[PDB]
Short mmCIF file of C-alpha atoms in Angstrom, two decimals:
data_model
loop_
_atom_site.label_atom_id
_atom_site.label_comp_id
_atom_site.label_asym_id
_atom_site.label_seq_id
_atom_site.Cartn_x
_atom_site.Cartn_y
_atom_site.Cartn_z
CA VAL A 1 131.41 92.26 98.13
CA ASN A 2 131.10 88.85 96.53
CA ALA A 3 132.85 88.93 93.81
CA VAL A 4 133.68 86.15 90.79
CA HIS A 5 136.37 86.34 88.17
CA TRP A 6 135.50 84.38 85.23
CA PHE A 7 138.14 82.42 83.31
CA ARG A 8 137.97 81.72 79.52
CA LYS A 9 141.29 82.79 77.86
CA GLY A 10 143.01 84.72 79.91
CA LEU A 11 144.69 82.08 81.85
CA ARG A 12 146.94 84.18 84.11
CA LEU A 13 147.42 86.24 87.10
CA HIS A 14 149.80 88.59 85.54
CA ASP A 15 148.74 91.56 83.50
CA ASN A 16 144.98 91.05 84.04
CA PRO A 17 143.51 93.92 84.59
CA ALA A 18 139.48 92.52 84.79
CA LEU A 19 140.52 90.72 87.87
CA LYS A 20 143.19 93.40 88.76
CA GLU A 21 139.78 95.33 89.21
CA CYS A 22 137.39 93.14 90.29
CA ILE A 23 139.75 92.89 93.35
CA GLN A 24 139.22 96.51 94.12
CA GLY A 25 136.66 96.67 96.49
CA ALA A 26 135.35 93.20 97.07
CA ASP A 27 135.20 91.67 100.33
CA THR A 28 135.53 87.73 98.72
CA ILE A 29 136.35 86.26 95.20
CA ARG A 30 136.19 83.15 93.26
CA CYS A 31 138.12 82.74 90.17
CA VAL A 32 136.33 80.61 87.78
CA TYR A 33 136.45 78.25 85.04
CA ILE A 34 133.35 76.80 83.34
CA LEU A 35 133.69 73.32 81.39
CA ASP A 36 131.13 72.43 78.50
CA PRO A 37 130.26 68.93 79.14
CA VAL A 38 139.28 68.32 69.10
CA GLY A 39 142.28 65.78 70.26
CA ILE A 40 144.26 65.28 73.25
CA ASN A 41 146.78 67.93 73.19
CA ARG A 42 144.67 71.03 72.90
CA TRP A 43 142.81 69.46 76.01
CA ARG A 44 146.27 68.19 77.88
CA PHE A 45 147.14 71.51 77.52
CA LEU A 46 144.50 73.17 78.74
CA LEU A 47 143.96 71.17 81.91
CA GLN A 48 147.68 71.72 82.43
CA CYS A 49 146.69 75.55 82.40
CA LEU A 50 143.90 75.00 84.86
CA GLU A 51 146.04 73.21 87.31
CA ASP A 52 148.56 75.72 86.88
CA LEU A 53 146.59 78.47 87.62
CA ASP A 54 144.88 76.63 90.87
CA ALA A 55 148.76 75.55 92.22
CA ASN A 56 149.13 79.63 92.04
CA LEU A 57 145.91 80.18 93.78
CA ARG A 58 146.73 77.57 96.46
CA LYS A 59 150.09 79.51 96.68
CA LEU A 60 148.11 82.91 97.57
CA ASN A 61 145.23 81.31 100.18
CA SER A 62 142.85 80.67 97.28
CA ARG A 63 141.82 78.15 94.83
CA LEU A 64 140.24 77.60 91.02
CA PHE A 65 136.47 76.47 90.76
CA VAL A 66 136.14 74.32 87.68
CA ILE A 67 132.44 74.75 87.29
CA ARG A 68 131.16 72.23 85.10
CA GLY A 69 128.21 73.04 82.60
CA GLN A 70 127.12 75.55 80.49
CA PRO A 71 127.66 79.30 81.15
CA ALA A 72 124.02 80.59 80.96
CA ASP A 73 122.59 78.05 83.42
CA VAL A 74 125.41 78.06 85.51
CA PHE A 75 125.55 82.09 86.40
CA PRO A 76 121.77 82.51 87.25
CA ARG A 77 122.63 78.97 90.35
CA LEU A 78 126.11 81.18 91.32
CA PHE A 79 124.55 84.77 91.67
CA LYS A 80 122.24 83.81 93.71
CA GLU A 81 123.97 80.52 95.81
CA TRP A 82 127.40 82.74 96.67
CA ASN A 83 125.10 86.21 96.39
CA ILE A 84 127.38 87.29 93.52
CA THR A 85 127.36 90.91 92.50
CA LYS A 86 130.25 91.34 91.02
CA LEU A 87 131.28 89.22 87.71
CA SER A 88 134.41 90.16 85.71
CA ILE A 89 135.67 88.89 82.18
CA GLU A 90 138.57 89.22 79.74
CA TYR A 91 136.89 90.77 76.59
CA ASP A 92 136.46 88.31 73.95
CA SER A 93 136.21 89.91 70.41
CA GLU A 94 135.40 86.99 68.60
CA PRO A 95 131.95 87.15 67.39
CA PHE A 96 130.27 83.90 69.02
CA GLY A 97 131.82 85.19 72.54
CA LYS A 98 130.66 88.89 72.29
CA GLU A 99 126.88 86.97 71.60
CA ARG A 100 127.42 84.37 74.74
CA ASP A 101 128.80 87.10 77.19
CA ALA A 102 126.20 89.57 75.65
CA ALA A 103 123.92 87.23 77.19
CA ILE A 104 125.98 86.46 81.12
CA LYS A 105 125.71 90.13 81.13
CA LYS A 106 121.54 90.70 80.18
CA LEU A 107 121.44 87.66 82.71
CA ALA A 108 124.35 89.37 85.23
CA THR A 109 121.82 92.84 85.12
CA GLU A 110 118.76 90.27 85.92
CA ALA A 111 120.63 89.46 89.23
CA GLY A 112 121.66 92.87 89.46
CA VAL A 113 125.57 91.98 89.25
CA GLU A 114 127.98 94.29 88.23
CA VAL A 115 130.39 92.87 84.96
CA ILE A 116 133.50 94.30 84.94
CA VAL A 117 134.70 93.74 81.45
CA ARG A 118 138.44 94.19 80.34
CA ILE A 119 139.95 93.80 76.95
CA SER A 120 143.69 92.42 77.32
CA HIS A 121 143.91 89.40 75.11
CA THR A 122 145.40 91.79 72.26
CA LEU A 123 147.13 95.08 72.10
CA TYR A 124 144.57 97.37 71.23
CA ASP A 125 140.71 98.06 71.50
CA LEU A 126 140.25 96.26 67.84
CA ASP A 127 136.37 98.18 67.70
CA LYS A 128 138.78 101.30 67.51
CA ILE A 129 141.13 100.02 64.94
CA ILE A 130 138.18 99.75 62.98
CA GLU A 131 136.69 103.07 63.49
CA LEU A 132 140.03 104.98 62.34
CA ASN A 133 139.50 102.95 59.10
CA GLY A 134 135.97 104.00 58.43
CA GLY A 135 134.05 101.16 60.27
CA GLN A 136 135.32 98.94 58.19
CA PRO A 137 138.55 96.22 59.26
CA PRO A 138 141.42 96.45 56.91
CA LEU A 139 141.66 93.61 54.76
CA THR A 140 145.09 94.45 54.23
CA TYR A 141 148.12 93.61 56.65
CA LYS A 142 149.87 96.47 54.89
CA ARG A 143 146.86 98.98 55.68
CA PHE A 144 146.91 97.35 59.25
CA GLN A 145 150.45 98.36 60.14
CA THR A 146 150.14 101.18 58.45
CA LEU A 147 147.20 101.94 60.32
CA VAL A 148 148.74 100.69 64.18
CA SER A 149 152.05 102.67 63.43
CA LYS A 150 149.41 105.39 63.86
CA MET A 151 148.02 104.44 66.61
CA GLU A 152 148.01 105.70 70.45
CA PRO A 153 150.58 104.04 72.65
CA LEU A 154 150.33 101.89 75.95
CA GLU A 155 150.37 101.70 79.14
CA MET A 156 152.18 99.23 80.89
CA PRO A 157 150.55 96.05 81.29
CA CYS A 158 140.20 90.31 100.21
CA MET A 159 140.21 86.39 100.92
CA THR A 160 138.19 82.96 99.19
CA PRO A 161 135.85 80.63 101.06
CA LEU A 162 136.47 76.90 100.52
CA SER A 163 134.83 73.92 102.06
CA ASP A 164 136.28 70.68 100.61
CA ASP A 165 136.83 71.10 96.95
CA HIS A 166 138.82 69.02 95.17
CA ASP A 167 135.63 66.90 93.94
CA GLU A 168 132.55 68.61 94.61
CA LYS A 169 133.37 70.11 91.18
CA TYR A 170 135.75 73.06 91.41
CA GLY A 171 138.63 70.32 91.09
CA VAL A 172 140.52 70.48 87.50
CA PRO A 173 139.04 67.46 85.54
CA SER A 174 141.25 64.74 84.08
CA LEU A 175 141.66 63.52 81.02
CA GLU A 176 140.28 60.45 81.83
CA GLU A 177 137.41 62.37 83.14
CA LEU A 178 136.99 63.59 80.14
CA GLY A 179 137.06 60.33 78.03
CA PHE A 180 140.78 59.90 77.27
CA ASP A 181 143.12 57.75 77.20
CA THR A 182 146.76 56.96 77.37
CA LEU A 183 149.38 60.12 76.68
CA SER A 184 152.99 59.91 76.63
CA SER A 185 154.22 63.35 77.88
CA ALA A 186 153.87 66.68 76.15
CA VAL A 187 156.40 69.01 74.24
CA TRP A 188 154.12 72.05 75.33
CA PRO A 189 153.82 72.13 79.18
CA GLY A 190 150.31 74.37 79.67
CA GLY A 191 150.29 77.13 81.90
CA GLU A 192 151.44 80.89 82.76
CA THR A 193 154.11 79.31 84.92
CA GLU A 194 155.62 77.58 81.86
CA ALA A 195 155.03 80.59 79.82
CA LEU A 196 156.97 83.46 82.22
CA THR A 197 159.89 80.45 82.09
CA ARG A 198 159.79 80.63 78.41
CA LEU A 199 159.77 84.02 77.71
CA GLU A 200 162.57 84.45 79.98
CA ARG A 201 164.06 81.56 77.68
CA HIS A 202 162.90 83.52 74.46
CA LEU A 203 164.32 86.98 75.42
CA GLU A 204 167.62 85.37 75.86
CA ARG A 205 167.52 83.75 72.68
CA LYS A 206 166.57 86.84 70.63
CA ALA A 207 169.05 88.67 72.51
CA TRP A 208 171.62 86.12 70.76
CA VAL A 209 171.16 87.66 67.35
CA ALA A 210 171.64 91.04 67.39
CA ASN A 211 174.58 91.08 69.95
CA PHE A 212 176.58 88.08 69.27
CA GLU A 213 176.23 86.96 65.57
CA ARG A 214 178.00 83.49 65.66
CA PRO A 215 175.82 80.42 64.36
CA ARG A 216 174.27 77.96 66.72
CA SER A 217 164.83 74.11 63.53
CA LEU A 218 161.53 73.16 61.76
CA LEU A 219 161.12 71.48 65.59
CA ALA A 220 159.22 72.75 68.89
CA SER A 221 161.58 75.32 70.32
CA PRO A 222 161.98 75.58 74.16
CA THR A 223 161.48 78.69 73.79
CA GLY A 224 158.46 79.04 71.79
CA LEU A 225 155.49 81.18 72.78
CA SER A 226 152.28 81.15 70.16
CA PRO A 227 150.17 78.54 72.40
CA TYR A 228 150.98 80.62 75.27
CA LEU A 229 149.83 83.36 73.80
CA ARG A 230 146.32 81.40 72.64
CA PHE A 231 145.40 80.75 75.77
CA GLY A 232 146.51 84.15 77.26
CA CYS A 233 149.22 82.41 79.36
CA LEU A 234 151.72 84.74 78.33
CA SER A 235 149.99 88.43 78.20
CA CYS A 236 150.57 89.86 74.67
CA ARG A 237 151.62 93.14 76.28
CA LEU A 238 153.90 92.05 78.64
CA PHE A 239 155.58 90.01 75.58
CA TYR A 240 155.03 93.72 74.05
CA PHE A 241 157.20 95.55 76.48
CA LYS A 242 159.78 93.58 77.06
CA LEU A 243 160.50 93.06 73.15
CA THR A 244 160.55 97.08 73.08
CA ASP A 245 163.19 96.81 75.75
CA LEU A 246 165.06 94.15 74.70
CA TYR A 247 165.01 96.31 71.10
CA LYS A 248 165.92 99.11 72.84
CA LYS A 249 168.69 97.88 75.04
CA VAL A 250 170.86 95.66 72.40
CA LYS A 251 170.15 97.59 69.48
CA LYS A 252 170.17 100.74 71.28
CA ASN A 253 167.45 102.18 69.81
CA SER A 254 163.99 103.55 71.04
CA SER A 255 162.25 103.03 67.55
CA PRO A 256 161.93 99.71 66.53
CA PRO A 257 160.65 98.75 63.49
CA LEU A 258 156.69 96.94 63.38
CA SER A 259 158.61 93.97 61.97
CA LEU A 260 160.08 93.07 65.51
CA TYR A 261 155.86 92.34 66.44
CA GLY A 262 154.88 90.66 63.20
CA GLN A 263 154.14 87.65 65.23
CA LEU A 264 151.93 89.84 67.55
CA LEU A 265 150.71 92.10 64.99
CA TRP A 266 149.85 89.20 62.28
CA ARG A 267 147.34 87.77 65.64
CA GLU A 268 145.93 91.31 65.88
CA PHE A 269 145.24 91.55 62.25
CA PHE A 270 142.93 88.59 61.92
CA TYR A 271 140.98 89.53 65.59
CA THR A 272 140.60 92.81 63.79
CA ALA A 273 139.08 91.52 60.92
CA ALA A 274 136.89 88.73 62.36
CA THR A 275 135.45 90.38 65.31
CA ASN A 276 132.59 91.85 63.30
CA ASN A 277 132.05 89.11 60.13
CA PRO A 278 130.10 85.98 62.04
CA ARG A 279 130.49 83.61 59.07
CA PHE A 280 134.54 84.77 58.90
CA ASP A 281 135.43 80.83 59.84
CA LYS A 282 132.85 79.93 56.60
CA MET A 283 133.32 80.24 52.34
CA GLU A 284 129.46 80.73 52.07
CA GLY A 285 127.82 84.08 52.97
CA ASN A 286 131.76 85.14 54.38
CA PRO A 287 131.48 88.51 52.17
CA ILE A 288 135.78 88.75 52.42
CA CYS A 289 135.64 84.92 51.24
CA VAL A 290 136.50 84.54 47.28
CA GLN A 291 133.77 81.69 46.08
CA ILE A 292 135.67 79.20 44.92
CA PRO A 293 134.83 75.26 43.01
CA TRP A 294 136.68 73.09 46.18
CA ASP A 295 135.85 69.90 45.61
CA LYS A 296 134.23 67.22 48.30
CA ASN A 297 137.36 64.71 48.74
CA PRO A 298 136.60 62.74 51.90
CA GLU A 299 139.17 60.16 51.35
CA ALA A 300 141.78 62.89 49.73
CA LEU A 301 141.11 65.30 53.35
CA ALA A 302 141.64 61.87 55.14
CA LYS A 303 145.08 60.89 53.90
CA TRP A 304 146.42 64.79 54.06
CA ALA A 305 144.85 64.63 57.70
CA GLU A 306 146.54 61.87 58.73
CA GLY A 307 149.73 62.28 57.08
CA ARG A 308 149.33 59.29 54.32
CA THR A 309 150.12 61.50 51.08
CA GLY A 310 152.94 59.54 50.32
CA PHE A 311 155.13 63.08 49.87
CA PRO A 312 156.88 62.53 53.06
CA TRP A 313 157.48 66.71 53.68
CA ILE A 314 153.70 66.49 53.47
CA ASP A 315 153.19 63.42 55.85
CA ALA A 316 156.07 64.64 58.45
CA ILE A 317 154.48 68.20 58.80
CA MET A 318 150.99 66.21 59.61
CA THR A 319 152.54 63.74 61.96
CA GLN A 320 154.64 66.32 63.81
CA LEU A 321 151.69 68.61 64.17
CA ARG A 322 148.87 65.27 65.07
CA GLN A 323 151.86 64.05 67.72
CA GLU A 324 152.61 67.22 69.49
CA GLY A 325 150.01 70.51 68.73
CA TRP A 326 152.35 73.14 66.61
CA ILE A 327 154.50 72.79 63.27
CA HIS A 328 156.41 75.83 61.99
CA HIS A 329 154.39 78.34 60.52
CA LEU A 330 156.29 77.73 56.83
CA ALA A 331 155.05 73.82 57.31
CA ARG A 332 151.52 75.40 57.93
CA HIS A 333 152.54 77.03 54.40
CA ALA A 334 153.57 73.67 52.71
CA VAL A 335 150.28 71.48 54.05
CA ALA A 336 147.84 74.00 53.31
CA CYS A 337 149.06 74.75 49.63
CA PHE A 338 148.77 70.81 49.27
CA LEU A 339 145.44 70.27 50.74
CA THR A 340 143.75 73.69 48.76
CA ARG A 341 145.13 75.91 45.92
CA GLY A 342 148.50 73.76 45.25
CA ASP A 343 147.19 69.75 45.14
CA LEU A 344 144.13 68.55 46.64
CA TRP A 345 141.70 71.30 45.60
CA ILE A 346 139.62 70.72 48.92
CA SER A 347 138.12 73.75 50.91
CA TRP A 348 140.46 75.23 53.32
CA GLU A 349 137.21 75.25 55.66
CA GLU A 350 138.17 71.05 55.78
CA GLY A 351 142.15 72.57 56.65
CA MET A 352 140.64 74.53 59.19
CA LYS A 353 138.44 72.12 61.10
CA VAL A 354 141.46 69.93 61.05
CA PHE A 355 143.72 72.67 62.33
CA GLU A 356 141.20 73.45 64.94
CA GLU A 357 141.51 70.20 66.63
CA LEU A 358 145.23 69.59 66.26
CA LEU A 359 146.91 73.32 66.47
CA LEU A 360 147.52 74.47 69.90
CA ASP A 361 147.74 78.35 69.39
CA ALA A 362 144.64 77.66 66.81
CA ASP A 363 142.17 80.55 67.24
CA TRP A 364 138.94 80.57 65.63
CA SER A 365 140.08 83.86 64.16
CA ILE A 366 143.43 83.29 63.86
CA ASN A 367 142.98 80.20 61.81
CA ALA A 368 140.00 81.04 59.48
CA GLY A 369 142.35 83.77 58.42
CA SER A 370 144.88 81.89 57.69
CA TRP A 371 143.36 79.54 55.94
CA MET A 372 141.52 82.14 54.03
CA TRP A 373 144.84 84.21 53.04
CA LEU A 374 146.85 80.59 52.82
CA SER A 375 144.17 79.39 49.84
CA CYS A 376 144.36 82.69 48.39
CA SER A 377 140.64 83.47 49.17
CA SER A 378 140.94 86.58 51.29
CA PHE A 379 143.82 88.92 52.44
CA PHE A 380 144.75 89.64 48.84
CA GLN A 381 147.91 91.24 49.69
CA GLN A 382 151.00 89.36 48.45
CA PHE A 383 150.61 86.33 46.38
CA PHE A 384 151.66 83.37 48.72
CA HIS A 385 152.82 81.70 45.63
CA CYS A 386 152.95 77.57 46.24
CA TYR A 387 156.35 75.95 46.82
CA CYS A 388 156.86 72.29 45.88
CA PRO A 389 156.31 69.44 48.48
CA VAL A 390 159.02 67.55 47.09
CA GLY A 391 161.65 70.57 46.58
CA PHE A 392 160.53 73.18 49.25
CA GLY A 393 161.46 70.77 51.62
CA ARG A 394 164.77 69.63 50.13
CA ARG A 395 165.58 73.37 49.91
CA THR A 396 165.10 73.55 53.62
CA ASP A 397 166.65 70.41 54.89
CA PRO A 398 168.47 68.46 52.74
CA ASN A 399 169.57 65.32 54.48
CA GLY A 400 165.89 65.20 54.92
CA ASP A 401 166.45 64.54 58.94
CA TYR A 402 162.89 65.89 59.80
CA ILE A 403 161.61 63.54 57.77
CA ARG A 404 163.59 60.70 59.49
CA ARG A 405 162.99 62.16 62.55
CA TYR A 406 158.98 61.77 62.03
CA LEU A 407 158.25 59.54 59.52
CA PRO A 408 160.95 56.71 60.83
CA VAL A 409 159.95 53.97 58.27
CA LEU A 410 161.43 55.97 55.95
CA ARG A 411 164.99 56.41 58.14
CA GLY A 412 166.57 54.02 55.97
CA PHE A 413 166.39 56.18 52.92
CA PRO A 414 169.30 58.25 51.67
CA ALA A 415 169.35 61.98 51.75
CA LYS A 416 168.73 62.05 47.82
CA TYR A 417 164.90 60.26 47.59
CA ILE A 418 164.23 60.29 51.19
CA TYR A 419 162.46 63.78 49.46
CA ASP A 420 160.39 61.72 46.86
CA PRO A 421 161.14 57.77 47.53
CA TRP A 422 159.17 56.81 44.90
CA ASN A 423 161.96 57.50 42.60
CA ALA A 424 164.57 55.31 44.47
CA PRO A 425 165.37 51.97 42.67
CA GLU A 426 163.99 48.45 44.40
CA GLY A 427 167.26 47.60 45.42
CA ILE A 428 167.34 50.87 47.68
CA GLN A 429 163.83 50.43 48.96
CA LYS A 430 164.66 46.87 49.53
CA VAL A 431 168.12 47.98 51.78
CA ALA A 432 165.95 50.88 53.39
CA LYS A 433 163.53 48.12 54.53
CA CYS A 434 160.62 50.21 53.11
CA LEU A 435 158.57 49.45 49.76
CA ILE A 436 157.14 51.94 48.69
CA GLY A 437 153.19 51.16 48.27
CA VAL A 438 153.88 48.37 50.79
CA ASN A 439 155.13 50.36 53.94
CA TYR A 440 154.69 53.56 52.97
CA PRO A 441 151.77 54.88 50.48
CA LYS A 442 152.89 55.56 46.98
CA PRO A 443 152.18 59.61 46.21
CA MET A 444 148.41 60.12 46.15
CA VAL A 445 148.39 62.53 43.35
CA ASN A 446 151.33 63.55 40.46
CA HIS A 447 152.50 67.36 41.90
CA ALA A 448 153.56 68.81 38.50
CA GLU A 449 150.12 67.58 37.19
CA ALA A 450 148.16 68.51 39.72
CA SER A 451 149.60 72.11 40.32
CA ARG A 452 149.10 72.60 36.52
CA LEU A 453 145.46 71.79 36.84
CA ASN A 454 145.23 73.84 40.00
CA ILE A 455 146.73 77.08 38.80
CA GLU A 456 144.62 76.56 35.72
CA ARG A 457 141.35 75.81 37.53
CA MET A 458 142.61 79.12 39.73
CA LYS A 459 142.53 81.79 36.64
CA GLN A 460 139.48 80.01 34.86
CA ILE A 461 137.64 82.23 38.36
CA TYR A 462 139.37 85.42 37.17
CA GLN A 463 139.19 86.22 33.77
#
């Protein structure tokens, strides 16, 4: 009779099995999102997801109920005031997620509410993947792959009562209503509609690699999907199913290579590896994490996080990240190294926390997992091997256009110092209108020296 679907992740109406199941047999249905009362970019992306769902719901004679407050306190009030008997959610594997939900399920049964749970934030049941592997998370992407290639296939991806809503809670809140601010548009608009738009574009574009050859960045693509996958605006099975069909249609081969799926499988690998380990995002007490004597250096952390390291490659990556909420993985790998095992010898937990506040596609699991691997703290498997924060940028973008773009103060520098401007003669700096040490900081560390010492440090811990 009375049903509620609770959005957390999975902010879509496509491939929503828990929602599809919840509407089955219900006389009424309310879609609900609960706001607890982390930078403006994630927050804005969130609000646009919510606003986006509401718009689609309105299209459907329904509308989104954004409830303000806490789940454990909101739900008994709802169950009673709305005479709910069914409540459904997407499955959340994240260790803290499981807990909250296991608790809302105890409450649910207290009010004799039925609780529909359905997996769809991942391609697989991770519990099952663990079972094969001996009741043990694969700690290697290879074994993990070896294991999913041997995994069963796939099954492709009533009214609502409103009143006077758009303010009695239930309306989507605004940046201002949260304590911000203002921003300046948004390189990554949030929501399902945006996400189904970019999937179309993305598929069209990947279609022009293997049956269209000819040549056409480090910049946000207008076909990029990572943030949409993190919030569930885009279903990962939809993505998958359409990826397969593209491969089979352009490559004429109905048995694609797992590497077509890397973006997806890496995601899954970390969800699997984290779901049973609540200390996954810490070093101490994290059973899979090597214990490393990282330093406490707030001031070094600060320069790193605020992109004032004096290494433009590093600083450009960090300001692109702070401004927009996304950065290419190669840049993730550069700034991660520089902060941890490469240069600064600061804990990966510290970089994890920064990324959580600024990175749009950061899940608890993915974020922790990456920082652990990137800093060589787990997931051993292929030594990532730190590339130079001068040479590695120089290798990628010889003219330093990416640098001029995100660090305009340096716009006036020649491509032969744009990566290492402290090596510009005084006359050049003057002509560039940027005195190194005055208008842009000097390098916070000697790179050669720092990685030298840092490689030492690391092998003392493996004698």
